């Protein structure tokens, strides 16, 4: 009897320990064509020059800095308002990201910034999951607000390329909903300004966005214990101790 | 009987496999106000100019390059000794970290040094868990030594800002103790020299420390199996096979 | 009877849910001496100047750039062919990595590149597991193609140092094989050109490779459920329900 009560006490405490915190598992999934995200860039003073997509070409052809044109980009720019303060004005320009990963597709963005007083020049940017959901559905102006309140924005360095290789992670929370977040790693490459005339000193920006790997990481949180197993086990131990008592009575 | 012995062999092998290596789980938690950490710096010859804390103001006001002043930073500088070799004398400068996470308080630092024969510009730094533990408690001079031998130090570049976003990860080892480590990612933004445009070419540094997200990740290693469940299951299989043998005898 | 059928329904559904996706666990391991790995380089037109190993010296001695010599490096330079397109010929350079981890040996490389038409100067590089596997075993010319179609190559910026701290992550899949992949984070330090100050403006590169920590992270995917436990549990529940039926008959 004392053995039974100690066993049931330890079992119930173990079940409490198991239920108070779950376990986490990871998984991967391959996509034939990535859903094209949207990269949000705050031009601010800066003016775009050329947004180009390189679907399969290994090398970007040699360019001529300082001139606009060659805009083959799906762009949508509307002035907005920051919901974090609601009294400040934020302005953005939205583009469509790289689609196919099998053939490396990189979007190449040239940015020229006019002369400014600020010592450290950089342009902020932000990424959200998909572009078509922001383009067509209703009430997406507030979608930008909640996306920026949820997603995080990190500015890229102003002066040289920041080759951005992004990735997608889908965590499956158990309350009937899904969460998507973007993980990216950047690679800065110094640029030679000798070809351009740097006597003016006006900063020129360059950004390249790419898909790191076709696979997307899926993370699931698993509950490790169920009441049915414990109740069956304790019933079995009760039965076996009853059988032992019956044997002792037979003795 | 043979079924019983094979089942017990398989179960004991499974239990040994479960016991030899555990399974990890992750957890998060919110904090109202982060504990003020400490940032350890090794300026060398680079005497600093201005350490300022920006509780909510988004942007540091433009800083005149070179001229000192505006020290609103809790700092202390004491010459130390390296425990790794014990014959090399190294000096460190210690500051307190940012605290306000909801207002994302950031610390702004600056450095200046006359040109030397180092051929490069970089200042090493190191982070430990808290400042009040280094200040008030007894025998913290050796706390520097064992924290340095435990923590890892990475130098920041010299000539442009290195925006550091740090987060604290707490892993709960099972032997009645706890471990704290810092995970950080840096962001470098180029700095324009044309403002001062001097002929001396003296290096100027800029560092910004910040908290990434309020969430603290907790990692615990959980053992997947316990002997009580396995012993109860083997007792149950013994009982059911005994009942089958009794039924066969009745037959 | 209905209780039994619903319980087995829930049990079989839970077992299917456990079977479809397993759980993942992580582990660490110390090594007395890391195996010497191999670093792949694609200099192209940039003939290197000096490859040096700093077995224990914390500090690299002051150098005089612009002139070749002092090649104390285990190098193997060959011309290859890209299997991705199979009509492109690319040249590679192969060196051995650092070995000593307790003394944290670091490898120093200097590259000089003549002025090029490309507006952004960078040298791509790739990492594979070991050097003696490429050098001594048979048909490793195709091992280069295998590794470059398997491993990922990331270019380093040209003009300033890119201090690379690599680490080895060894995951072991369940179908009788293991996977080794390298995770690295770079640390760029600005390089001062005031020492030479030429009017040619030719590029100079510097790379330093070093092990991050002696620990090797090992990842195993663990199956969480096995048929023996659930079949024994359902047999036990069937037996106890049969006992309940016998008791009801007795009543």
PDB file of N, CA and C in Angstrom, chain A residues 23-27 56 58 62-63 65 102-104 108 160-161 163 165 185 187-192 194-195 206 220 222-226 228-229 232-233 235-236 239 242, chain C residues 7 10-11 14 18 21-24 82 84-85 115-122 153-160 188 199-203 221 224 233 236-237 239-240 243:
ATOM      1  N   UNK A  23       8.381  19.988 -25.084  1.00  0.00           N
ATOM      2  CA  UNK A  23       9.630  19.787 -25.802  1.00  0.00           C
ATOM      3  C   UNK A  23       9.473  20.356 -27.207  1.00  0.00           C
ATOM      4  N   UNK A  24      10.605  20.684 -27.823  1.00  0.00           N
ATOM      5  CA  UNK A  24      10.638  21.319 -29.132  1.00  0.00           C
ATOM      6  C   UNK A  24      11.297  20.387 -30.139  1.00  0.00           C
ATOM      7  N   UNK A  25      10.760  20.371 -31.358  1.00  0.00           N
ATOM      8  CA  UNK A  25      11.281  19.559 -32.444  1.00  0.00           C
ATOM      9  C   UNK A  25      11.399  20.409 -33.700  1.00  0.00           C
ATOM     10  N   UNK A  26      12.299  19.999 -34.594  1.00  0.00           N
ATOM     11  CA  UNK A  26      12.564  20.727 -35.826  1.00  0.00           C
ATOM     12  C   UNK A  26      12.295  19.813 -37.014  1.00  0.00           C
ATOM     13  N   UNK A  27      12.056  20.438 -38.164  1.00  0.00           N
ATOM     14  CA  UNK A  27      11.795  19.717 -39.402  1.00  0.00           C
ATOM     15  C   UNK A  27      12.086  20.648 -40.569  1.00  0.00           C
ATOM     16  N   UNK A  56      19.262  33.936 -63.479  1.00  0.00           N
ATOM     17  CA  UNK A  56      20.236  32.862 -63.622  1.00  0.00           C
ATOM     18  C   UNK A  56      21.660  33.337 -63.857  1.00  0.00           C
ATOM     19  N   UNK A  58      25.243  34.440 -63.461  1.00  0.00           N
ATOM     20  CA  UNK A  58      26.122  34.370 -62.300  1.00  0.00           C
ATOM     21  C   UNK A  58      26.624  35.752 -61.905  1.00  0.00           C
ATOM     22  N   UNK A  62      28.680  44.861 -65.596  1.00  0.00           N
ATOM     23  CA  UNK A  62      29.300  46.089 -65.110  1.00  0.00           C
ATOM     24  C   UNK A  62      28.385  47.283 -65.354  1.00  0.00           C
ATOM     25  N   UNK A  63      28.230  48.111 -64.331  1.00  0.00           N
ATOM     26  CA  UNK A  63      27.264  49.197 -64.320  1.00  0.00           C
ATOM     27  C   UNK A  63      27.967  50.544 -64.435  1.00  0.00           C
ATOM     28  N   UNK A  65      27.723  53.943 -62.336  1.00  0.00           N
ATOM     29  CA  UNK A  65      27.124  54.639 -61.192  1.00  0.00           C
ATOM     30  C   UNK A  65      26.874  56.111 -61.477  1.00  0.00           C
ATOM     31  N   UNK A 102      16.081  27.838 -57.224  1.00  0.00           N
ATOM     32  CA  UNK A 102      16.858  26.856 -57.978  1.00  0.00           C
ATOM     33  C   UNK A 102      17.893  27.537 -58.862  1.00  0.00           C
ATOM     34  N   UNK A 103      17.459  28.492 -59.672  1.00  0.00           N
ATOM     35  CA  UNK A 103      18.352  29.427 -60.336  1.00  0.00           C
ATOM     36  C   UNK A 103      18.457  30.656 -59.449  1.00  0.00           C
ATOM     37  N   UNK A 104      19.671  30.961 -59.000  1.00  0.00           N
ATOM     38  CA  UNK A 104      19.853  32.028 -58.026  1.00  0.00           C
ATOM     39  C   UNK A 104      19.301  33.344 -58.564  1.00  0.00           C
ATOM     40  N   UNK A 108      18.914  43.462 -57.506  1.00  0.00           N
ATOM     41  CA  UNK A 108      20.014  44.405 -57.374  1.00  0.00           C
ATOM     42  C   UNK A 108      19.445  45.812 -57.337  1.00  0.00           C
ATOM     43  N   UNK A 160      28.612  50.677 -49.313  1.00  0.00           N
ATOM     44  CA  UNK A 160      29.068  49.491 -50.021  1.00  0.00           C
ATOM     45  C   UNK A 160      27.960  48.448 -50.033  1.00  0.00           C
ATOM     46  N   UNK A 161      28.140  47.433 -50.878  1.00  0.00           N
ATOM     47  CA  UNK A 161      27.144  46.376 -51.005  1.00  0.00           C
ATOM     48  C   UNK A 161      26.949  45.645 -49.688  1.00  0.00           C
ATOM     49  N   UNK A 163      25.332  42.181 -49.391  1.00  0.00           N
ATOM     50  CA  UNK A 163      24.698  40.999 -49.961  1.00  0.00           C
ATOM     51  C   UNK A 163      23.902  40.280 -48.882  1.00  0.00           C
ATOM     52  N   UNK A 165      21.421  37.380 -47.712  1.00  0.00           N
ATOM     53  CA  UNK A 165      20.905  36.047 -47.999  1.00  0.00           C
ATOM     54  C   UNK A 165      19.892  35.704 -46.916  1.00  0.00           C
ATOM     55  N   UNK A 185      21.421  36.682 -43.148  1.00  0.00           N
ATOM     56  CA  UNK A 185      22.822  36.984 -42.900  1.00  0.00           C
ATOM     57  C   UNK A 185      23.340  37.862 -44.030  1.00  0.00           C
ATOM     58  N   UNK A 187      26.480  40.087 -46.093  1.00  0.00           N
ATOM     59  CA  UNK A 187      27.883  40.052 -46.494  1.00  0.00           C
ATOM     60  C   UNK A 187      28.226  41.386 -47.139  1.00  0.00           C
ATOM     61  N   UNK A 188      29.007  42.200 -46.443  1.00  0.00           N
ATOM     62  CA  UNK A 188      29.423  43.499 -46.956  1.00  0.00           C
ATOM     63  C   UNK A 188      30.660  43.320 -47.822  1.00  0.00           C
ATOM     64  N   UNK A 189      30.716  44.060 -48.925  1.00  0.00           N
ATOM     65  CA  UNK A 189      31.852  44.035 -49.839  1.00  0.00           C
ATOM     66  C   UNK A 189      32.220  45.474 -50.160  1.00  0.00           C
ATOM     67  N   UNK A 190      33.466  45.846 -49.881  1.00  0.00           N
ATOM     68  CA  UNK A 190      33.914  47.207 -50.143  1.00  0.00           C
ATOM     69  C   UNK A 190      33.891  47.491 -51.639  1.00  0.00           C
ATOM     70  N   UNK A 191      33.609  48.741 -51.993  1.00  0.00           N
ATOM     71  CA  UNK A 191      33.461  49.140 -53.386  1.00  0.00           C
ATOM     72  C   UNK A 191      34.553  50.129 -53.762  1.00  0.00           C
ATOM     73  N   UNK A 192      34.994  50.070 -55.017  1.00  0.00           N
ATOM     74  CA  UNK A 192      36.010  50.998 -55.491  1.00  0.00           C
ATOM     75  C   UNK A 192      35.336  52.258 -56.014  1.00  0.00           C
ATOM     76  N   UNK A 194      37.064  54.917 -57.072  1.00  0.00           N
ATOM     77  CA  UNK A 194      37.974  55.651 -57.944  1.00  0.00           C
ATOM     78  C   UNK A 194      37.350  55.909 -59.310  1.00  0.00           C
ATOM     79  N   UNK A 195      36.598  54.937 -59.831  1.00  0.00           N
ATOM     80  CA  UNK A 195      35.995  55.092 -61.150  1.00  0.00           C
ATOM     81  C   UNK A 195      35.014  56.255 -61.173  1.00  0.00           C
ATOM     82  N   UNK A 206      24.275  50.085 -52.367  1.00  0.00           N
ATOM     83  CA  UNK A 206      23.961  48.933 -53.200  1.00  0.00           C
ATOM     84  C   UNK A 206      23.508  47.793 -52.304  1.00  0.00           C
ATOM     85  N   UNK A 220       8.200  22.639 -34.395  1.00  0.00           N
ATOM     86  CA  UNK A 220       6.981  22.266 -33.695  1.00  0.00           C
ATOM     87  C   UNK A 220       7.295  21.993 -32.233  1.00  0.00           C
ATOM     88  N   UNK A 222       6.227  19.979 -28.958  1.00  0.00           N
ATOM     89  CA  UNK A 222       5.563  18.704 -28.717  1.00  0.00           C
ATOM     90  C   UNK A 222       5.319  18.543 -27.224  1.00  0.00           C
ATOM     91  N   UNK A 223       4.091  18.190 -26.862  1.00  0.00           N
ATOM     92  CA  UNK A 223       3.788  17.775 -25.497  1.00  0.00           C
ATOM     93  C   UNK A 223       4.201  16.317 -25.336  1.00  0.00           C
ATOM     94  N   UNK A 224       4.900  16.016 -24.245  1.00  0.00           N
ATOM     95  CA  UNK A 224       5.583  14.735 -24.123  1.00  0.00           C
ATOM     96  C   UNK A 224       4.803  13.684 -23.344  1.00  0.00           C
ATOM     97  N   UNK A 225       3.742  14.061 -22.634  1.00  0.00           N
ATOM     98  CA  UNK A 225       3.023  13.109 -21.801  1.00  0.00           C
ATOM     99  C   UNK A 225       1.521  13.299 -21.960  1.00  0.00           C
ATOM    100  N   UNK A 226       0.779  12.220 -21.727  1.00  0.00           N
ATOM    101  CA  UNK A 226      -0.672  12.219 -21.789  1.00  0.00           C
ATOM    102  C   UNK A 226      -1.246  11.511 -20.571  1.00  0.00           C
ATOM    103  N   UNK A 228      -3.701   9.414 -20.331  1.00  0.00           N
ATOM    104  CA  UNK A 228      -4.136   8.039 -20.553  1.00  0.00           C
ATOM    105  C   UNK A 228      -3.041   7.047 -20.185  1.00  0.00           C
ATOM    106  N   UNK A 229      -1.799   7.338 -20.576  1.00  0.00           N
ATOM    107  CA  UNK A 229      -0.700   6.430 -20.269  1.00  0.00           C
ATOM    108  C   UNK A 229      -0.495   6.305 -18.764  1.00  0.00           C
ATOM    109  N   UNK A 232      -3.462   4.334 -17.154  1.00  0.00           N
ATOM    110  CA  UNK A 232      -3.340   2.908 -17.423  1.00  0.00           C
ATOM    111  C   UNK A 232      -2.219   2.289 -16.599  1.00  0.00           C
ATOM    112  N   UNK A 233      -1.087   2.987 -16.472  1.00  0.00           N
ATOM    113  CA  UNK A 233       0.026   2.440 -15.702  1.00  0.00           C
ATOM    114  C   UNK A 233      -0.323   2.314 -14.224  1.00  0.00           C
ATOM    115  N   UNK A 235      -3.363   2.074 -12.948  1.00  0.00           N
ATOM    116  CA  UNK A 235      -4.348   1.006 -12.827  1.00  0.00           C
ATOM    117  C   UNK A 235      -3.676  -0.360 -12.877  1.00  0.00           C
ATOM    118  N   UNK A 236      -2.680  -0.517 -13.752  1.00  0.00           N
ATOM    119  CA  UNK A 236      -1.954  -1.779 -13.833  1.00  0.00           C
ATOM    120  C   UNK A 236      -1.208  -2.075 -12.538  1.00  0.00           C
ATOM    121  N   UNK A 239      -3.663  -3.163  -9.964  1.00  0.00           N
ATOM    122  CA  UNK A 239      -4.080  -4.539 -10.207  1.00  0.00           C
ATOM    123  C   UNK A 239      -3.009  -5.530  -9.769  1.00  0.00           C
ATOM    124  N   UNK A 242      -2.960  -5.720  -6.046  1.00  0.00           N
ATOM    125  CA  UNK A 242      -4.109  -6.505  -5.609  1.00  0.00           C
ATOM    126  C   UNK A 242      -3.854  -7.995  -5.798  1.00  0.00           C
TER     127      UNK A 242
ATOM    128  N   UNK C   7     -10.318   4.261 -26.430  1.00  0.00           N
ATOM    129  CA  UNK C   7      -8.958   4.380 -25.922  1.00  0.00           C
ATOM    130  C   UNK C   7      -7.944   3.936 -26.968  1.00  0.00           C
ATOM    131  N   UNK C  10      -7.664   6.685 -29.627  1.00  0.00           N
ATOM    132  CA  UNK C  10      -6.785   7.772 -29.206  1.00  0.00           C
ATOM    133  C   UNK C  10      -5.325   7.335 -29.211  1.00  0.00           C
ATOM    134  N   UNK C  11      -5.052   6.111 -28.755  1.00  0.00           N
ATOM    135  CA  UNK C  11      -3.677   5.628 -28.696  1.00  0.00           C
ATOM    136  C   UNK C  11      -3.069   5.512 -30.088  1.00  0.00           C
ATOM    137  N   UNK C  14      -2.406   9.009 -31.499  1.00  0.00           N
ATOM    138  CA  UNK C  14      -1.223   9.592 -30.877  1.00  0.00           C
ATOM    139  C   UNK C  14       0.054   8.933 -31.385  1.00  0.00           C
ATOM    140  N   UNK C  18       3.130  10.720 -33.297  1.00  0.00           N
ATOM    141  CA  UNK C  18       4.524  10.603 -32.881  1.00  0.00           C
ATOM    142  C   UNK C  18       5.397  10.068 -34.010  1.00  0.00           C
ATOM    143  N   UNK C  21       6.502  12.743 -37.316  1.00  0.00           N
ATOM    144  CA  UNK C  21       7.613  13.673 -37.131  1.00  0.00           C
ATOM    145  C   UNK C  21       8.363  13.334 -35.850  1.00  0.00           C
ATOM    146  N   UNK C  22       9.679  13.106 -35.912  1.00  0.00           N
ATOM    147  CA  UNK C  22      10.444  12.813 -34.693  1.00  0.00           C
ATOM    148  C   UNK C  22      10.917  14.066 -33.975  1.00  0.00           C
ATOM    149  N   UNK C  23      11.699  13.884 -32.913  1.00  0.00           N
ATOM    150  CA  UNK C  23      12.260  14.987 -32.149  1.00  0.00           C
ATOM    151  C   UNK C  23      13.765  15.028 -32.395  1.00  0.00           C
ATOM    152  N   UNK C  24      14.374  16.158 -32.042  1.00  0.00           N
ATOM    153  CA  UNK C  24      15.792  16.391 -32.273  1.00  0.00           C
ATOM    154  C   UNK C  24      16.476  16.711 -30.951  1.00  0.00           C
ATOM    155  N   UNK C  82      33.638  23.736 -63.584  1.00  0.00           N
ATOM    156  CA  UNK C  82      32.398  23.860 -62.822  1.00  0.00           C
ATOM    157  C   UNK C  82      31.375  22.840 -63.307  1.00  0.00           C
ATOM    158  N   UNK C  84      28.217  22.769 -62.409  1.00  0.00           N
ATOM    159  CA  UNK C  84      26.880  23.355 -62.463  1.00  0.00           C
ATOM    160  C   UNK C  84      26.471  23.667 -63.897  1.00  0.00           C
ATOM    161  N   UNK C  85      27.377  24.257 -64.674  1.00  0.00           N
ATOM    162  CA  UNK C  85      27.141  24.520 -66.088  1.00  0.00           C
ATOM    163  C   UNK C  85      27.907  23.571 -66.998  1.00  0.00           C
ATOM    164  N   UNK C 115      44.580  46.005 -60.583  1.00  0.00           N
ATOM    165  CA  UNK C 115      43.337  46.722 -60.839  1.00  0.00           C
ATOM    166  C   UNK C 115      42.485  45.970 -61.854  1.00  0.00           C
ATOM    167  N   UNK C 116      41.202  45.813 -61.534  1.00  0.00           N
ATOM    168  CA  UNK C 116      40.287  45.015 -62.333  1.00  0.00           C
ATOM    169  C   UNK C 116      39.108  45.870 -62.774  1.00  0.00           C
ATOM    170  N   UNK C 117      38.409  45.389 -63.805  1.00  0.00           N
ATOM    171  CA  UNK C 117      37.280  46.141 -64.340  1.00  0.00           C
ATOM    172  C   UNK C 117      36.061  46.033 -63.431  1.00  0.00           C
ATOM    173  N   UNK C 118      36.015  45.006 -62.586  1.00  0.00           N
ATOM    174  CA  UNK C 118      34.871  44.821 -61.702  1.00  0.00           C
ATOM    175  C   UNK C 118      34.782  45.959 -60.693  1.00  0.00           C
ATOM    176  N   UNK C 119      33.560  46.447 -60.477  1.00  0.00           N
ATOM    177  CA  UNK C 119      33.340  47.560 -59.563  1.00  0.00           C
ATOM    178  C   UNK C 119      33.333  47.130 -58.103  1.00  0.00           C
ATOM    179  N   UNK C 120      33.327  45.827 -57.830  1.00  0.00           N
ATOM    180  CA  UNK C 120      33.325  45.302 -56.471  1.00  0.00           C
ATOM    181  C   UNK C 120      34.286  44.126 -56.398  1.00  0.00           C
ATOM    182  N   UNK C 121      35.329  44.261 -55.584  1.00  0.00           N
ATOM    183  CA  UNK C 121      36.416  43.294 -55.528  1.00  0.00           C
ATOM    184  C   UNK C 121      36.231  42.388 -54.317  1.00  0.00           C
ATOM    185  N   UNK C 122      36.160  41.080 -54.564  1.00  0.00           N
ATOM    186  CA  UNK C 122      36.048  40.086 -53.508  1.00  0.00           C
ATOM    187  C   UNK C 122      36.543  38.748 -54.031  1.00  0.00           C
ATOM    188  N   UNK C 153      29.701  28.306 -50.599  1.00  0.00           N
ATOM    189  CA  UNK C 153      30.833  29.216 -50.686  1.00  0.00           C
ATOM    190  C   UNK C 153      30.362  30.651 -50.510  1.00  0.00           C
ATOM    191  N   UNK C 154      31.063  31.392 -49.659  1.00  0.00           N
ATOM    192  CA  UNK C 154      30.762  32.790 -49.393  1.00  0.00           C
ATOM    193  C   UNK C 154      32.030  33.610 -49.573  1.00  0.00           C
ATOM    194  N   UNK C 155      31.928  34.697 -50.326  1.00  0.00           N
ATOM    195  CA  UNK C 155      33.079  35.524 -50.649  1.00  0.00           C
ATOM    196  C   UNK C 155      33.415  36.448 -49.488  1.00  0.00           C
ATOM    197  N   UNK C 156      34.690  36.805 -49.385  1.00  0.00           N
ATOM    198  CA  UNK C 156      35.139  37.756 -48.380  1.00  0.00           C
ATOM    199  C   UNK C 156      35.495  39.085 -49.036  1.00  0.00           C
ATOM    200  N   UNK C 157      35.229  40.168 -48.311  1.00  0.00           N
ATOM    201  CA  UNK C 157      35.396  41.509 -48.849  1.00  0.00           C
ATOM    202  C   UNK C 157      36.867  41.811 -49.118  1.00  0.00           C
ATOM    203  N   UNK C 158      37.095  42.644 -50.129  1.00  0.00           N
ATOM    204  CA  UNK C 158      38.431  43.005 -50.561  1.00  0.00           C
ATOM    205  C   UNK C 158      38.772  44.426 -50.143  1.00  0.00           C
ATOM    206  N   UNK C 159      39.880  44.557 -49.420  1.00  0.00           N
ATOM    207  CA  UNK C 159      40.353  45.831 -48.915  1.00  0.00           C
ATOM    208  C   UNK C 159      40.660  45.840 -47.434  1.00  0.00           C
ATOM    209  N   UNK C 160      39.936  45.062 -46.634  1.00  0.00           N
ATOM    210  CA  UNK C 160      40.189  44.998 -45.205  1.00  0.00           C
ATOM    211  C   UNK C 160      40.100  43.550 -44.750  1.00  0.00           C
ATOM    212  N   UNK C 188      35.296  41.777 -39.549  1.00  0.00           N
ATOM    213  CA  UNK C 188      36.040  42.651 -40.446  1.00  0.00           C
ATOM    214  C   UNK C 188      36.680  43.775 -39.641  1.00  0.00           C
ATOM    215  N   UNK C 199      49.465  55.880 -55.804  1.00  0.00           N
ATOM    216  CA  UNK C 199      48.545  56.448 -56.777  1.00  0.00           C
ATOM    217  C   UNK C 199      47.923  55.395 -57.685  1.00  0.00           C
ATOM    218  N   UNK C 200      48.403  54.151 -57.629  1.00  0.00           N
ATOM    219  CA  UNK C 200      47.818  53.094 -58.446  1.00  0.00           C
ATOM    220  C   UNK C 200      46.483  52.629 -57.877  1.00  0.00           C
ATOM    221  N   UNK C 201      46.357  52.604 -56.551  1.00  0.00           N
ATOM    222  CA  UNK C 201      45.121  52.175 -55.927  1.00  0.00           C
ATOM    223  C   UNK C 201      44.836  50.693 -56.013  1.00  0.00           C
ATOM    224  N   UNK C 202      45.863  49.865 -56.187  1.00  0.00           N
ATOM    225  CA  UNK C 202      45.660  48.426 -56.286  1.00  0.00           C
ATOM    226  C   UNK C 202      45.164  47.853 -54.964  1.00  0.00           C
ATOM    227  N   UNK C 203      44.328  46.825 -55.065  1.00  0.00           N
ATOM    228  CA  UNK C 203      43.698  46.222 -53.902  1.00  0.00           C
ATOM    229  C   UNK C 203      44.671  45.325 -53.145  1.00  0.00           C
ATOM    230  N   UNK C 221      18.637  13.154 -34.411  1.00  0.00           N
ATOM    231  CA  UNK C 221      17.183  13.123 -34.458  1.00  0.00           C
ATOM    232  C   UNK C 221      16.691  11.843 -33.797  1.00  0.00           C
ATOM    233  N   UNK C 224      10.501   9.254 -30.982  1.00  0.00           N
ATOM    234  CA  UNK C 224       9.977   9.430 -29.635  1.00  0.00           C
ATOM    235  C   UNK C 224       9.104   8.278 -29.155  1.00  0.00           C
ATOM    236  N   UNK C 233       0.765  -1.461 -23.434  1.00  0.00           N
ATOM    237  CA  UNK C 233      -0.225  -0.659 -22.724  1.00  0.00           C
ATOM    238  C   UNK C 233      -1.644  -1.042 -23.127  1.00  0.00           C
ATOM    239  N   UNK C 236      -2.537  -4.347 -21.628  1.00  0.00           N
ATOM    240  CA  UNK C 236      -2.847  -4.200 -20.210  1.00  0.00           C
ATOM    241  C   UNK C 236      -4.238  -3.615 -20.003  1.00  0.00           C
ATOM    242  N   UNK C 237      -4.618  -2.626 -20.815  1.00  0.00           N
ATOM    243  CA  UNK C 237      -5.943  -2.033 -20.652  1.00  0.00           C
ATOM    244  C   UNK C 237      -7.029  -3.031 -21.052  1.00  0.00           C
ATOM    245  N   UNK C 239      -6.753  -6.282 -20.677  1.00  0.00           N
ATOM    246  CA  UNK C 239      -6.810  -7.224 -19.564  1.00  0.00           C
ATOM    247  C   UNK C 239      -7.576  -6.646 -18.380  1.00  0.00           C
ATOM    248  N   UNK C 240      -7.336  -5.374 -18.049  1.00  0.00           N
ATOM    249  CA  UNK C 240      -8.025  -4.799 -16.898  1.00  0.00           C
ATOM    250  C   UNK C 240      -9.514  -4.632 -17.183  1.00  0.00           C
ATOM    251  N   UNK C 243     -10.989  -7.954 -16.655  1.00  0.00           N
ATOM    252  CA  UNK C 243     -11.155  -8.173 -15.221  1.00  0.00           C
ATOM    253  C   UNK C 243     -12.387  -7.448 -14.694  1.00  0.00           C
TER     254      UNK C 243
END
